[PDB]
Each structure stands twice: as C-alpha cells, then as structure tokens.
Amino acid sequence: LDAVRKRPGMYIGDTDDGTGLHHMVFEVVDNAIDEALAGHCKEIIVTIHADNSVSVQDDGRGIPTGIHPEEGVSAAEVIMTVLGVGVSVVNALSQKLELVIQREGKIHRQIYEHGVPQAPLAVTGETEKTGTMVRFWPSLETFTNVTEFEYEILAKRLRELSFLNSGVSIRLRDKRDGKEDHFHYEGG
Amino acid sequence: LDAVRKRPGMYIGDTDDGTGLHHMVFEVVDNAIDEALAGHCKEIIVTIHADNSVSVQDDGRGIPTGIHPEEGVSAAEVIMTVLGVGVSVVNALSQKLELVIQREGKIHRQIYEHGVPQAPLAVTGETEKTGTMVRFWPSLETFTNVTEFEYEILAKRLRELSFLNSGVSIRLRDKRDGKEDHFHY
Numbered sequence A: 001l002d003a004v005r006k007r008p009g010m011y012i013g014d015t016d017d018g019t020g021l022h023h024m025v026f027e028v029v030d031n032a033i034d035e036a037l038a039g040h041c042k043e044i045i046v047t048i049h050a051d052n053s054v055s056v057q058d059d060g061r062g063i064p065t066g067i068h069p070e071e072g073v074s075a076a077e078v079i080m081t082v083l084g085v086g087v088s089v090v091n092a093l094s095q096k097l098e099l100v101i102q103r104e105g106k107i108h109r110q111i112y113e114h115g116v117p118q119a120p121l122a123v124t125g126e127t128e129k130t131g132t133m134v135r136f137w138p139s140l141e142t143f144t145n146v147t148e149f150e151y152e153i154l155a156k157r158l159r160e161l162s163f164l165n166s167g168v169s170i171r172l173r174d175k176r177d178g179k180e181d182h183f184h185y186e187g188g
Numbered sequence B: 001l002d003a004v005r006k007r008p009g010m011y012i013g014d015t016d017d018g019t020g021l022h023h024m025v026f027e028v029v030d031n032a033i034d035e036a037l038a039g040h041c042k043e044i045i046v047t048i049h050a051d052n053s054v055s056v057q058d059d060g061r062g063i064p065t066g067i068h069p070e071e072g073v074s075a076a077e078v079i080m081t082v083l084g085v086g087v088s089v090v091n092a093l094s095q096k097l098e099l100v101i102q103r104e105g106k107i108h109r110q111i112y113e114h115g116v117p118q119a120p121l122a123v124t125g126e127t128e129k130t131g132t133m134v135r136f137w138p139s140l141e142t143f144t145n146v147t148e149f150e151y152e153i154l155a156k157r158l159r160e161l162s163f164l165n166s167g168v169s170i171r172l173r174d175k176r177d178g179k180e181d182h183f184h185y
C-alpha cells in the first residue's frame, strides 16, 4: 500500500476539491453492488454518520474469509491490503476502517487504521444473516479543505446507478439531519 | 513496510514497557557507527531533544544519494523504505523522520511520515562537510505508556558500544535538562 500512500492523488483523484473524497464512497459502493448482484433480494445501504464516516453494507454472500494459501492471511485482508481503483486504496487513505462480514453463520470483524490491520480477522459471534459492511473514516492527513460528505453528490450518483442495476435496492441515509432516500428499479 | 506496521513488537521489541522505544535509537546508532568508521574523524552525536525526538548524526562519507537502478528512487530512500533490523523499521514506526545527507559538495534533505516519503530526496544547498543525520519522532500510536526517552538507558548502551568500537567517538546530549556525556576509548 505504500505506493498509494506516496502519491494518493494518482489513485483516488484530487484530494483538495472533494472529488477524491466522494470517489472513496463510490469505489466502496461499486464493490457492494457487485456483492448485491450475487443474491436474490439485493439491498445496499449507504449511511453518512454524524462523525463524517460513511458505511456501505450489502446483504450478499459475504466476501471470502478463509486464509489465503500464499499470503497467509484471511482473503478479506488480502482484498483490503493488496493493490475501479480497488477497496484497498480506500483502506490505505482511511484513518480508520471497520470491516464486518456475515458468512456461514458467523460474524467476522476486523479494524484497520491507515490501511494497517489492528488484528487478524476474527469470528466474534453468530448470525442468521449474510453480507459485508465497510465503515470508513477518511484520513484528514490526506483529505484537506473539503472533508465532509455532501448528501446531494451521493444521492444523485446512487439514483443514476439504480437504473443500471435492476432489482438492487439502494438506500441512502444521513444521520446528521435524518434525510433518507430509497432508489429501487425493477427493469427487466 | 506494512509487515512492520502490522506487528511492530516483533521487529522493534515491546512497545509498552520502553524496550522498543529505546531500540529505535540503537538501530539508527548501528548505521551511524558503520558510516563513522568509514570516515576520517569517526564521531557520532546522539541528541535527545526537548520535544521527545532523537537525532543521530555521523561525520562519515554520507549515505549514497544516486538513483537505485532496480527501485527507481534514491539509494537513501531504498535504505529508509525497504527491509540488525534496519533503519527502515525505525522509519515505519516514526510519526516523522528527517533525513539530512552531506555528500559530494551538496546537502540533501527528505522528510518521512510513518515511513512515507513526503517528497523525493532533494538537493537543498552546498557544503564542504560530509555525513548523515536522522532525526525521528517515535509514533505515539505505536509506543505507549513509556513514551519518553530515559537518558541512562541510552548512556548505558552507547558506553558498551564505545568499548567495542574503540576508534569511534560517541557524544550523548540531553536538551531537556542539559545532561551530557562523551564516550571514547
């Protein structure tokens, strides 16, 4: 990940004007839509939190959790730490990132800071549900000037995405002011 | 460097009791001694600064500044960013690190933050002197409880090194309380 840390602008885009900041969300959304497309119900929820972190969750199968034979760490960690632009870029440029994977009846939890895992992926409990959730806090060391998520930029993009992805429910929630939207298109 | 960041204790030593914190200084000192031996004057100065950083300087030839043909960056950057455990470990676990190299009539400077270079090694001026200097600020995210450098732990190890490296002068300075020593065999 040090290649991304050396020149963040080359991977995420302009880190001053806010376009790079919002590209962080859309990169994670693309991964969530991919996971949502595999599965029948297909819902993603994008939440702008009061602390200016964003979470993106899907109810798909859950990203793989088994140990990668070569890398010697969970497949999830490989996805988060090995170089659209990839979720590993978002991880590298986030001062904190929380990963929650529900898969094979088990809840898996891992925490990252600036792309560095704080511990190995751990089974913390049990669950009837399946899916992946990433919540990330953009790095204030990288993202300057514009450091807050504008609702309208996300809302407009997710509406455009809904029409390309049939049967996928996309919910947008703003916990700062309670503003909500639900984009769901059934075409085909 | 992410392997070091992931398990700092395995490379530097215990990050809570102060062992790891002081090993950061000793790792830089090892490289300073090697450089000091290859020069004429053969002196190292270890300075504990008031803001809880440590600088280690030698008066040797200066570490190489030219572009590494494989890595495609300065040889100095390769030393600071590629895996004694190496100064790259110290760089990875320092919230800031300042590198200054005096070599071939020129002063070179570079700044790192958590092992990430902020710019390429750059020529900032001219000089007749030669040597290398690294000043590092230990990461308070990694190093907990014992965050401040105890003078006597450093003094003890530098004394041992002065006997083993008989030709090399070693000065220790503490800018917090003005305490100082000069170890030379």
Ligand SMILES: Nc1nc2ccccc2[nH]1
Pocket: A005, A113, A114, A116, A141, B005, B113, B114, B116, B141
């Ligand atoms: N604050 C901070 N910034 C970092 C960049 C890379 C790795 C660890 C870091 N901790």
Ligand SMILES: Oc1ccc(Cl)cc1O
Pocket: A028, A031, A032, A035, A056, A057, A058, A063, A079, A087, A132, A133, A134
């Ligand atoms: O829902 C998600 C699915 C996959 C990734 Cl990498 C991130 C997500 O947030």
Ligand SMILES: Oc1ccc(Cl)cc1O
Pocket: B028, B029, B031, B032, B035, B056, B057, B058, B063, B079, B087, B132, B133, B134
């Ligand atoms: O004096 C020094 C010489 C070489 C290195 Cl890598 C670090 C120093 O501080």
